[PDB]
Structure formats: C-alpha cells, structure tokens
RNA sequence: AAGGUAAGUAU
C-alpha cells in the first residue's frame, strides 16, 4: 500500500547494488548485468530477494552447448510475451487478513479433527492434517513436533523476545515471533525456483559463471 | 596472456595472474602445438605428409593479437587439393578450388567473454582478418586456422582442409581438448581457485565382487569394531552386572595378507569409566 | 606498549612429538570434520534460513 | 564373521589374553595354509565361522 | 601539539630517511599550522607511540625544505610519503596517485593496518603494495 | 572432395623414457621442465627415484618371515 | 625517545604560533600571515 | 669434484646462508658478517660465466660456539637488500653419501 | 601401436637466439 | 534495463501480493506413516548381560518419528 | 578530467 515504502526500498536495493559494484571496481558498470546479484548462493552468486521489478534482458538470456556433434545456441527467455523479470518479494507473502482467515478456518478444522480423533481411541490423524499444512498464524505445522510438550512450558516468550534487544547486542529483525515458537509463517520454496528459471534456468545461469571452463559435467553432485 | 580486461579489477586481475602463473599461456600453446604435431606426423601416411615441422616462433607469438608467425607448416609430397575456406561444421568439399604444396595451421588461444563466447563467429573472423591481412606473413596461401576458447573450453576451425583430413583435424581436437596436459593443470587451477571442489565419487560400498576378487586386491584389511568395545558383563541374581571392558583388540583379519592384526590394548584403556559407545 | 613488529612467519624448525602433541592439544582437528563444502544444488533451506 | 573369535575358546582365551596394552600378532588360520586355493582359504574359514556365529 | 621530530633543514630529511634499516620513514610533508595537516599530525602522534617499534615519523616543512616540493610533486596539504628503505613504495589504495596519502586518516586503527601491510611489502622486498581497504569511496553514505 | 577417408586411429598419449603413460602432473612438469630448460634439483630427482623405486617394488608384489618365526614358541 | 627533546617542542610551537595567527599573535591577520 | 671444499673442510662449523642478491653477496659483505674473530668462507655458489650467484652461500668457522651465536645472530638482517636467511649446513661428501647409501638397509 | 617421445623448445632463459628454435 | 532496479509503483497494478504463493508440504510423509503402521500393528499385537564379551549391544529436529500428534 | 602507472633486475 505504501508507495513511500516501495520507493524507499528500491532506493537503498540500488545503494546496496551500487556498493557492490564499487567493490567490484571503482567505475561505474554502464550495462551491470543482473545475474550476478540474483544467482542463489548454491549456484555460487549473492542471491539478493529483491522486491524490485527489474527485467532481464534478452541478449543476456542466451546459452550455448559445445556437443560433439555441433555448436547448439539456446534461448529460455524466447517466449513473446513480456521481458523476463526476476519475481518481487511480494508474489509470495500471504496476505495479512488471508493469513488470519486461513489461520481461524484451519484451526476450526484442526479443533474438528481432534474432536473426532478423540473417540478414535487414539491420538490424532497427524496424516490427514496434511491437507492443512503450512498454514495458520500458530504453528499449526509444528502443533506436531516433538518439543510442543517442552514449548508448552513456556509462557509470553513475545515480551521476552522484544526485550532481547536490551539482552542482546545485535539487532533482531524477527521480534514479531521466535522462530521455532510461531513457525515459519512465510513459506519462501517456491522464490527460489522462480528466481532461478526466470533468469534463463541454471544451464542460462552457468553460461556465465566459467562453469564450461571445467570439463568435468558437474552439473549436480558438485562441492 | 591473451585475456583483454575492461577496467582495472583488482580482484579479477590477481586471480588472472594466479591462474596464468609461469607464463601458462605460452605453456598451453606450446602443449597444443606439440600435440598436433604429433597427431599429424602419426598419421602422416595417408595425409602425404613428407614435411610436418613449426617456425622459429618469437616467444611473444603465442599470446599476441595477430598471428604474424605461421604454427604448424606441412608440405607434402607433389600437390595438395585443397578447398574453399569453411568451418568444420560443414560437409561439402569440392578440393579442385586449389592446389597446392604447402599447409599451414595455426591454434588461437583466446578467452571467451559472456558476449564473446561465439567461437564459430570469432573463428571466420579471425580467419577473414589474419589471411586477409598485411602485417600477418604466411609461407602458404592455403590452410585452416584453429580456435580454443579457454573460457569456453571450446574448439573450432576455419579455413581449407587436407582431402579426407576434416573428420581427422575434428577428432585430434576432440582428443586433445579432452585430456591436454595443459588445458587439465589450467583446469586443476580454476577448480582450486574458485573452490568449486569436484563432484565426490561413490565408493563401491558393494562386496559381493570384491570377495571374489579379495586375492586380486594387493593389500586389504578388516577390523570389528564392536570387538574393541566388546565388554564382558557379570550375571547375578541380586547383584548389578559388571560390564567390564575385556580387551582392546578389535578382531583385525586380513585374508588376503596371509595373517591377522591383533591391536591388543588394556581392558581399561579400551573402555574408561563413564564412557559411552561414541 | 608498542605493538610487536610483524615479522614474516617462520615454520617450526624441526616438528617434535612436544611440539606434535601441541598441535594435538590446539589446533583445527575439529573445524576440519565440519566440511564447509556446499553442493551446486539448491539446499532443501529458505534463502535466508541462517 | 568376527564372533567366531569370540565364540572360539582359543581366541577367546586371546580375548583374555588381549588385555596386555601392548600390540599382540595373531597368526592365520591353519585351515587357510592347508587350503591349496589362497582365494577359496578365506572362504573355508568364513565357512566354518559363519556357522560358528550362528551356533 | 605537533610534537613529533621535525626536519629544520632539507638535507637533514634526506640523511635520516638514508639513515634507515629495518624500519619504515613516514615522511609526512606539509605545515603544522594548516587544520587538516594538524589532525593528520595528531593522527601520527596518536600511532607512534603504538608502532615506535619499526614505524619512525619524521614531519618536515615545505617551506623549510622546497627543494623536495618539485622532486615528488609536493603540492597538496597531509601529503604522507612511506620512503622505506630508501625506496619510494607504491601503495595502493584505490587512488590515482598511488605514492601519497594527502589526507588525514579518519581512524587510527586504519593508519596502523596501512602501515605494518607497507612494512611487511618492504621487508619482503616489493616495491608495490596494496591496501586492504580501498579509498575510491569514502562510504559516505 | 572425393577424399573416401578413414576414421583415423590416432589418440592422445605421452610416452616417458620407460614408456609408461604419465599422469597428466607429470606431463605438464615434463612440459615447464623443457621450456626452463633444466629440470629439478639433485634432491628432487633423488626423491623422484626414490619413489619410482618405491612404486616398481610395490607392482612386483613379508608375512612368510612372520608366520615362520612364530612357528617357533 | 620517540618524541622530539623539549626545546625542538618549543621551537615548533613558537613556529605554529608565528605562522597561524588566528588564535595566536597580537590580531589575526590570516591562517598563513607571516606577520598577525 | 669440489678440491676447493676438502680445504674449506677445515673448519667445521658451516654454515649456509640464502636469499642472496646476484649484486648484493659480496667479499665485503662477508667481511661484515664475520663478527667472530675466527676465520671466515666467503665462497658462494655462481654462474660459471657471468658469475651472477645464485643466492646461496657457505662461511666457514673453526668456533662451534660462534657457530650458535651467529645462527641467532644474523638471522633476518644483513646489511644488503636481499634479507639474510641462515641454516645448518647438511653438505655431504662423497664419501658420506657411499656410507649412507650402504647403511641405507637398516 | 607405437609412440617416440616429443620434444619441446627451451624458450625460457634461453639467449641463443631471439626466435624460438625450432 | 539491468542498469538499476525499476521502481515497483510503476508495474504495481500488474498483480496481486502472493498471487504465485503456494503452501508447503511435509517432510517424510510416507516414512512416517510407515513407521506409525508399524507402530499401531506392533500395539495391536501386544494388546490382544552374559560372560561373552561382544553380548552387549553397540550403542553408537522436533519432528514426531511416530507420526502421531501428541 | 579522472577514481585503470605491477613490482624486480643490471644496462
């Protein structure tokens, strides 16, 4: 909602960029191409999530495979539609008032199945309740992990956390919850595949990274 | 060496002359060189070759930008047909274009960039400006220059070819490229320096062929774990069990060695007090 | 107080089993096993698990 | 099969005899030096200690 | 307070650099009285007392000494030339001119790792050195 | 064209004094060796013979002494 | 020691006072004025 | 092959110096490093031609004690450029290489 | 199959002649 | 275009906030549902240190291995 | 404008 907040952001994501740049060299890039700060870290690059919308370009976006038989050039980024463009952080937050209402839905639907399972003669599905996954504000998703009987234990860790910034030395981003106490709300799996094939798949990727410098096919596998 | 560097990275730059240390470039092209050379003269026979020898290459020649110094010279015996310039991608030949009694191939070491990579492309022009050029001296008018991106790691050639010697010069390139000793120690160094350590192997966990090649192995040899951490324990009705530790052999044998190894250690220094299995 | 002079680091002259038994005391037996190699596959991890 | 130490009362006396800190040499069996075939001498070793650990 | 030992006269600059062995001469051109000069001064007053040890500063005054403002090219303020040796090392810091440091440091503990790294490149007998932190920028921001 | 030509049957290989295929280490310190023009130390070459020895022993095959001895009690 | 003896610190201080005149002298003339 | 090395035999505490520049190792030079009263060895290995040395050098003493004061002593500074590297001379002779070689089996 | 050894030029510290020899 | 990342107020109204976000899945369903049959089999079944010195046994997160909520 | 001089070695 805030258009300040996404200006302000963008912002300082170019400072931080122009600050590698300037580590990289003391000029300036007059292109700066963008596969180098959005290549995860297991593809060797900075894998910066960015909630920017910057759009690849084409002419970065070919590769080529030096078989036996020939010289092959391929494109992934060929598709006559709009230029590919990394995807912003956003097209995968759950929405606020989304999150509560999943939350309220899929514990009535945790309260239900429990209630159910309580004349089964035994302990809940744990199964079944995969239907549920990832969801809810609470850790619905460790509401069966093994520490819960440890966690029950405590009480009002939020106040605690929030303080740890008189505890602790170092700032804590995630003082809203603990991790491990609240679960992981946000689900960030799927980023890292879009990231990754929107920049023109890891073959499109490696094409500039020296990895054909190396004769070995460690495409997978490698350390 | 023959890399071209826009703006001065001092990162970029260091690990360049780390990777080319002790003039590597002039090392490769002189690995290819011979390599080729060998290739050729082992084939001589069918390629007519009477003469397959190298110029008196100023040492600089190897990484300069044009090719003033020819590499590899073959003459042959009385004539040699050779073709309109190509690349091996092709397949037509028509040899009556030229004749003539002298070859001459030359190896371009070059570094690919992420927008210069295309070694087809650079091949002909390449091709096109040192043959089509003052300052380059050739002995003779007819022959095919070859391309290796480093970077890339990819080889390519431009020009005529001998009769029957285009799927040969493939071949040889494929070869050498994939087991140069240069071009391997350049490799070795890129691994190293990037730390991207090679794929890891999987041992053969598998035994049901190694026992029947147990004697074929030279040396080989098992030990028991659990028999160094064997403890023998008391009984008693009422008693608590004395686990005590026994001994520190662990069982070692080796079948293939004609003898066993008896690693014998205090019952105590096998196993102390409050020690666990890990 | 002054800072002492960083002189170029010279190697022990001859190791000893002492000397060996130092480096059995201190050393990085224990950093070592942990292996900091990283597979060229994405991790089953969020980008900024930590 | 490394039980058959264990269940063998001559390597289980060694077992005994095992508790000096000191390395002991525990020579091959004679089974293998009487078996012609090297190759097939482990494997009539092992077929004896198999059984052994199983009974 | 500007302290630090002073060449009255220019060739007494020139014997005692010569007069070195084993040690660095941080000889630091300019004018005690310009501001900038001052809290490079005390700059180098604050680390002497730290790395007394192989690290000397010898400041001297352009207009006592003119004959070494053209040898060099003397004309900038907190000029700091590290003539080790009897060589005039080539430090890098990400700068154009790469043989003087024309201004005052901010930290000291930045001054102090600039100069044990251009002692330890003049011990090992280079004439060029780099820096560990580049001054392209000055991470204004 | 009409150059009806053969596969050819050349492959890369390097040949040593003993005409053992080197590693590709050894080719390339054969290579830096002729391109110096001198090759390694006196104590270098003594450590690589030292090893060649070593590895040729190695190929050819002291448990016999053993057993004979403990056959005595 | 490392520092200069006492009278080379006098001499530098009265040279400093000499040459900047802004907080020293009988008027401030200029930062470099020979004379205040 | 070395006649002139039985008669710098006489001394026994040898030691070998390093990091020699082709310019900087010199007659003078070792002059100055012989601190100790005894006889010194200047000798240090050179091009036959040229005579460009190739950084290495022995010195010769007859006192074992000034051998151990001057392992310490000149260690890192030497008035040249190249900075002065010492250590303990492990030249052999012929002789001692035959006997090696013969004890070599255990 | 057969295989004679392969020679190299001694570029390196070489002041016999400017050009390589060959 | 790559020369600096483009300001979101520009392509805001092209989507929606998560219009690609997709929940998670578990971990080792299948084992753990295995290891729960095994379990739950062993239950129903159930309700309806010598000399030798090797007799011993060789004793070499927050995730249910049962696959029951507790 | 620039922020892009490798050092070393005797001539």
């Known amino acids: 909602n805030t258009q300040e907040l996404l200006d302000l952001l963008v912002k300082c994501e170019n400072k931080i960029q122009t600050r590698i740049k300037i580590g990289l060299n003391s000029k300036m890039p007059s292109r700066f191409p963008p596969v180098v700060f959005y290549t995860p870290k297991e593809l060797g690059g900075l894998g910066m999530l960015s909630m920017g919308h910057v759009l690849i370009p084409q002419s970065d976006l070919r590769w080529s495979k030096q078989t036996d038989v020939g010289i092959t050039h391929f494109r992934s980024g060929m598709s006559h539609e709009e230029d590919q463009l990394i995807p912003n952080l956003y097209r995968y937050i759950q929405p606020w008032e989304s999150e509560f209402i999943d939350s309220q839905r899929v514990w009535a639907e945790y309260a239900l199945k429990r209630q159910e399972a309580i004349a089964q003669n035994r302990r809940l599905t744990l199964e079944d309740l995969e239907d549920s996954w990832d969801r809810g504000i609470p850790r619905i998703n460790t509401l069966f992990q093994k520490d819960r009987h440890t966690l029950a234990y405590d009480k009002g860790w939020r106040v605690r956390t929030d303080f740890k910034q008189y505890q602790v030395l170092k700032q804590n981003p995630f003082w809203w919850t603990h991790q491990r106490h609240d679960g992981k709300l946000w689900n960030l799996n799927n980023y890292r595949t879009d990231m990754i094939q929107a920049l023109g798949g890891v073959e499109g990727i490696l094409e500039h990274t020296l990895f054909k410098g190396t004769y070995f096919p460690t495409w997978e596998g490698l350390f | ?86 690349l091996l991608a092709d397949s037509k030949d028509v040899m009556d274009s030229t004749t003539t009694q002298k070859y001459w191939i030359d190896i371009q070491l070059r570094w690919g960039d992420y927008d210069s990579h295309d070694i087809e492309r650079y091949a002909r022009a390449k091709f096109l400006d040192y043959t089509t050029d003052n300052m380059s001296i050739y002995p003779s008018p007819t022959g095919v220059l070859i391309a290796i991106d480093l970077a890339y790691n990819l080889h390519s050639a431009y020009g005529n070819w001998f009769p029957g010697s285009k799927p040969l010069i493939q071949q040889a390139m494929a070869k050498i490229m994939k087991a140069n000793p240069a071009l391997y120690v350049l490799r070795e160094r890129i691994r190293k320096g990037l730390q991207l350590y090679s794929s890891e192997p999987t041992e053969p966990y598998l035994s049901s062929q190694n026992y029947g090649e147990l004697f074929s192995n030279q040396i080989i040899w098992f030990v028991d774990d659990t028999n160094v951490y064997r403890v023998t324990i008391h009984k008693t009705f009422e008693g608590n069990l004395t686990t005590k530790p026994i001994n520190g052999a662990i069982f070692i044998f080796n079948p293939r060695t004609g003898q066993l190894f008896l690693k014998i250690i205090h019952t105590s220094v096998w196993a102390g007090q409050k020690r666990l299995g890990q | 107080k002054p800072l002492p002079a960083p002189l170029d680091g010279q190697r022990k002259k001859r190791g000893g089993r002492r000397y060996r038994k130092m480096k059995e005391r201190l050393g990085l037996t224990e950093i070592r096993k942990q292996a900091n190699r990283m597979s060229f596959g994405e991790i089953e991890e969020d980008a900024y698990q930590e | ?49 198999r059984a052994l650990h199983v009974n | 307070s500007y302290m630090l030992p002073h060449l009255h006269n220019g060739w007494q600059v020139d014997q005692a650099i010569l007069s070195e062995e084993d040690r660095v001469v941080v000889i630091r051109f300019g004018h005690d009285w310009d501001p900038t000069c001052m809290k490079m001064d005390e700059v180098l007053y604050s680390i002497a007392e730290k790395v007394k040890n192989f690290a000397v500063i010898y400041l001297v005054d352009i207009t006592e000494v003119p004959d070494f403002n053209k040898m060099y090219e003397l004309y900038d303020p907190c000029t700091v030339m590290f003539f080790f040796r009897n060589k005039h090392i080539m430090i890098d ?40 932190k580049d001054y392209s920028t000055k991470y204004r921001y | 064209k009409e150059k009806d030509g053969y596969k050819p049957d050349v492959k890369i290989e390097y040949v040593d004094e003993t005409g053992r295929k080197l590693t590709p280490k050894e080719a390339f310190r054969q290579l830096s060796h002729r391109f110096h023009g001198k090759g390694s130390g006196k104590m270098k070459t003594e450590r690589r013979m030292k090893k060649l020895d070593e590895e040729a022993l190695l190929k050819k095959m002291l448990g016999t002494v053993a057993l004979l001895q403990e056959k005595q009690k | 020691e490392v520092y200069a003896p006492g009278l080379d610190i006098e001499s530098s201080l009265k040279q400093l006072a000499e040459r900047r005149t802004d907080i020293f002298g009988v008027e401030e003339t200029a930062i470099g004025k020979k004379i205040g | 092959e070395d006649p002139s090395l039985l008669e710098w035999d006489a001394d026994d505490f040898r030691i070998f110096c390093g990091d020699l520049g082709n310019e900087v190792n010199d007659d003078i030079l070792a002059r100055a490093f012989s601190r100790f009263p005894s006889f010194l060895k200047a000798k240090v290995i050179r091009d036959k031609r040229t005579g460009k040395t190739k950084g290495y050098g022995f010195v010769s003493f007859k006192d074992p004690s000034d051998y151990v004061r001057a392992m310490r002593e000149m260690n890192g500074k030497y008035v040249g450029s190249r900075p002065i590297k010492l250590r303990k001379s492990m030249w052999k002779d012929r002789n001692l290489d035959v006997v090696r070689k013969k004890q070599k089996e255990k | 199959n057969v295989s004679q050894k392969r020679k190299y030029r001694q570029y390196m510290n070489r002041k016999g002649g400017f050009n390589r020899p060959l | 275009p790559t020369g600096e990342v483009l300001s979101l107020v520009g392509k805001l109204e092209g989507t929606r906030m998560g219009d690609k976000a997709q929940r998670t899945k578990p971990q080792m369903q299948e084992e753990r549902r295995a290891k729960r049959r095994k379990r739950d089999e062993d239950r129903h079944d159930i309700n309806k240190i010598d000399e030798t010195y090797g007799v011993n046994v060789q004793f070499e997160g927050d995730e249910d291995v049962y696959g029951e909520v507790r």
């Open chain 5, 93 to 132: 810091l990400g700068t154009g001119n790469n043989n003087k440091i024309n201004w005052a440091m901010e930290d000291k503990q930045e001054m102090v790792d600039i100069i044990e790294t251009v002692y330890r490149g003049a011990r090992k007998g280079r004439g060029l050195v780099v820096s560990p």
């Open chain 2, 1 to 86: 060496t023959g890399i071209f560097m826009h703006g001065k990275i001092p990162t970029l730059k260091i690990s360049l002359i780390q990777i080319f240390r002790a003039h590597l470039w002039q090392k490769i092209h002189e690995s290819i060189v011979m390599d080729l050379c060998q290739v050729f003269d082992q084939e001589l026979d069918a390629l007519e070759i009477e003469t397959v020898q190298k110029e008196t290459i100023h040492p600089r020649k190897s990484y300069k930008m044009n090719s003033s110094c020819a590499d590899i010279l073959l003459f042959a015996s009385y004539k040699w047909n050779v073709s309109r310039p190509s």
């Open chain 4, 1 to 49: 099969p490394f039980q058959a130490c264990l269940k063998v009362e001559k390597f289980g006396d060694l077992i005994l005899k095992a508790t000096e800190p000191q390395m002991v040499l525990f020579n091959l069996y004679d089974d293998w030096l009487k078996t012609i075939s090297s190759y097939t001498a482990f494997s009539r070793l092992i077929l004896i200690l």
